[model samples]
Target chain A: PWSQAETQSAHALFRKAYQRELDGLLATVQAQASQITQIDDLWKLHDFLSAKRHEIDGKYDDRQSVIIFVFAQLLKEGLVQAEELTFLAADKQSKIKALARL
Target chain B: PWSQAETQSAHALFRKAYQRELDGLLATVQAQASQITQIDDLWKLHDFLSAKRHEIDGKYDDRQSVIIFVFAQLLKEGLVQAEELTFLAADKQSKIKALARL
Candidate 1:
């Protein structure tokens, strides 16, 4: 069996690799002009992303848990305007409908 | 605002806590006899899992990044048999048909 410390170290490298893959995937999505549809692909992306999150960092610092925090910061500082622009471009109705209904 | 070292330490502990919560959720899932349906719930579980992954370890070492390697080992030997057993009882046709096709 591997030492916990060694496993932890190995886990660290594994996690780093996983994140790069995600960023790469997101970059692909971004490059494609944020044309995301079919929630399954998103889930697949997130699933692999989640597992790697836990593997290196232990079961603790998961991607979903952290990203919400990241998202909150983006929203607070109005950093999400670029993304919103893309959203508006993607479908003005999707964004407006949600707000209009509320 | 935070020193890198302080932030690193804080991030590490945050990761540890996050993992414990996930394990707890998994324990609940396990307690419910592995009754996992509605891929959305699963998706939510994994998303948070993926994000926490990148925050502490950098997007490089994601949870998805490592678990595939771990799952490979489980399949290489036989550790996943326990999960398979639960899977079998959960819904036999889905499991058998999957293999039946192969």
Candidate 2:
């Protein structure tokens, strides 16, 4: 059996790996979001990116979870400027906020 | 823009939350494993628990990802003893190893 201290050390490495993977996935998704033309494209892009997200960090199991995080941050940081997608982005943002409070 | 140092600090907190959540979910799943009677029941338990996992972590998006980690460690440490389930558990273990090597 692993000692608690050893497991704790392992956990730290595991977490750092998770963070690195999350950052990499976020960067890829952010780059892809710029090319979305149709509403369906966004969903498709979400699926592709989230699959990679799960590959890198397989603790979360909903594509929408990543979508919610990505879309919410984009709007919050003013990286999203499309007027047509504003309502959709805001909806995703509100949904994430609601889940956070639950 | 948030300073890189500030973001790094925030990432640390985020990872701590993730590890805490992963541990909680793993503990719950481990406790639940004793009550599993059928393969179908195992799948159901995974769904219920993983939804909570997603709520807490929202970074990984495949229940099998969590299952891979859990089952691999369980067998690696001799935590599972059910003979009938040996093949199944070993199958999961092998799958995880294969994924890890990919």
Candidate 3:
């Protein structure tokens, strides 16, 4: 087993990377959603992802612990967005739903 | 299974120790149903040990990875603070409950 300190540092680094990936994924999804003509429907996802991304980015707080909190939050929000995506006006939601199902 | 460059050192200088040992075994346990107790009950355990021996110390920001997060935060803080370890340190469920029953 690794020493405790060594282990903790490793975890912190991993969380940082994971949040970054999530942020990138959200950005890509938003860009795709931007193409949808139904502004009201499309913007919901854009707003949701943006708000989630903001939370992940340490918008409201700047503690090391925020990363951990955000990780759990995203896991939760991801499910919520998946549900809404099922109802998006465009076909993008269906595709997203399929990918999410996987 | 722990490696991610969190700690530059981890020697046997101050071996891993537990909190709330026999030294201060069962401090004054005052029973009060409505007493104002500003207690973050969980972190207190092993807190002294960490201060002296540095049990788990890690740092992090966003843009990190999941693996890093685990190594840095999850195993160290999460594992240590995890209620399950109470059983590991004293595996007899009934025994632990008995000890804690007081």
Candidate 4:
């Protein structure tokens, strides 16, 4: 079982990556909004936003059991640094680092 | 059954009202986008867009059988002018005007 501090750290890492994703989407959405001159363009933007919402919702799993894997993914993508996660349980860090390198 | 000319006219009316809706949504979306600064704000924008998309998809019913009713709703909302529908058959124009006033 993971300790309370580990769980909090996991949540923090997840939030950092999630915020990164939202920031990127904000810029893209603004750009798309600027080009919305017609219903067709609005529909296009709606479809794009719908797709991205689904993608983002599905990508960031925070279940305690799979959090190591989630952090590994963030690490692999360079969204979170391994050094930031050094305070987690040794086993959790080991799994995260191994999967992140895979 | 509506004649081809009537169907074309209905489609044109629907498009004009739909365009009006899209233009309004575009401005609102841009305003919302400009205020997005966090994950919560992004989710709020997503929820708002999804609701608007569903509302628009349902409101602009283009079925030939009920296009008069759709046009009536648009007229009631001032999205379409009553005079623009004068060229339709007297029965259709009569029903739309009655419903628009109701």
Candidate 5:
């Protein structure tokens, strides 16, 4: 098993990388509502992955943890711009609802 | 499975409870070296508990996660007074070393 310090370092590194990506996407808009749905789907994925942490062996695969942490932190800190959100517009919401039925 | 919002709410509540405990302990000091050693042991406990999150069933036991998060945050935020630290004095360190031999 990895030491606490090692795990902490990995988490820190992952967070920095995610922050960089978030910065790059700040001015970009989601081209499709599907992108928004995918992002929303991540929360469920996070729950599943976390629950399966033990099955991964000695060292757990924490990618979902990293992504969820970064997402919440970025959103909480107001680092995510309006243009980066797929669910900001009413049309996008309607599109998502339509796609859900298919 | 609990909804993402429900999981998030649980995490938020645990964090708040840990924060309260941290606040109450800010003025206290370890009377014995064993106390200091025990606190340090918690880091390893944090590592073990997190890696074992999956074995706890559908919803992971996140108490260790909560403790580590609160400890780091309180330490970073300077909410913990120096007097509250058990390892602040060198004599305590010597005491811990001696205890390990016994």
Candidate 6:
């Protein structure tokens, strides 16, 4: 139940976390990508990347219908901080923060 | 229209080429993977891998319905040679060679 402006703000917040985490994922993967010498090594790299890619993708959600819960999940996952959702309604923000605790 | 032994032989032939070329793919990508020090580098490694994975996948076909033509395609691409198809009937082998020429 987000308005357009609120939805846009939520998207921006999610993107901020998404970009930062993606950079972190890349940082974590640099050496793994670099050391692929054999078919075994190459497949291991691909497998790890595929898993991380799915993990990151699964961590963010921006559906217009239920993005607040998405924000809650992101907050719990440490991808988004509670304060960043300040642009949202206080009730929505508090709700997200509370849900994140569980 | 391949029999059991023929199908298995075709599979073995395809696997031999597949294994060899996969090794080649890893060799091509090893240096690229090892050079990943940045987000850009990591993505380049991923992009190159994605492309090559797809290319190698598309180059081999092993369907029960038309594996002869698949072998023909493989021969043309140099993954399978003309001589390897000798276990097949002479006419089938000749067809593959002739089709590969075109």
- DockQ score of each predicted structure, in the order shown: 0.08, 0.01, 0.01, 0.64, 0.01, 0.33
Lowest lDDT 10-residue stretch of candidate 1 chain B: B81-90
lDDT of 4 by residue, A7-73 (tens): 7877887888888877778888878877666667767877888898897777778786776677888
Error of 3 at A36 (Å): 1.1
lDDT for each residue of candidate 1 in A3-90, tens digit (9 for 90 to 100): 4554454345335544554455444433322332443444454555455445535422435334333323333433333333232223
DockQ score for model 6:
0.33
- How would you encode candidate 5's per-residue C-alpha lDDT over A58-100 as one tens digit per residue? 2223564343344334444444432343323445334334443
lDDT: worst 10-residue window of model 3 chain A = A79-88
Q: Give the lDDT ranking, best first.
A: 4, 6, 2, 1, 5, 3
In model 6, which residue pairs have backbone atoms overlapping below 3 Å? A33-B33, A34-B33, A34-B34
What lDDT tens digits, residue by residue, belong to model 6 across residues A1-102? 567788788788878887888777876566664565567777677777777777766666666667777788888888888778878888998989888888
Clash pairs (backbone) in predicted model 5? none
Output the TM-score of candidate 2.
0.26
For TM-score, candidate 3 versus 5, the one ahead is 3
Better by DockQ, candidate 5 or 4: 4
**Which pairs of residues have clashing backbones in candidate 2?**
A59-B60, A60-B60, A60-B61, A61-B61
Cα error, candidate 2, residue B66 (Å): 44
Candidate 5 recovers what fraction of true contacts?
0.00
Candidate 5 lDDT by residue in tens digits, B1-102: 334554565466445545554333321211111233333342343343344333323332446344334433444444443234342244533443344334
Tens-digit lDDT track of model 3 for B1-102 = 322332221111011222222112212111111121332221232233234233233332223233223322423443223343232223322333443333
Q: TM-score of the second chain in each model?
A: 0.32, 0.43, 0.17, 0.77, 0.29, 0.72
State in Å the error of residue A101, model 1: 48
Ranking by TM-score: 4, 6, 2, 3, 1, 5
- Which structure is stronger by TM-score: 3 or 4? 4
**Per-chain TM-score (chain B), model 4:** 0.77
Residue-level lDDT of model 6, residues B11-93, one tens digit each, is 79989989878866776676665566666676677777778778776766787566777888778878777888888888899
Cand. 4 TM to true fold:
0.76
Identify the leading candidate in terms of lDDT. Answer: 4
TM-score of chain A of each: 0.32, 0.44, 0.35, 0.71, 0.29, 0.75
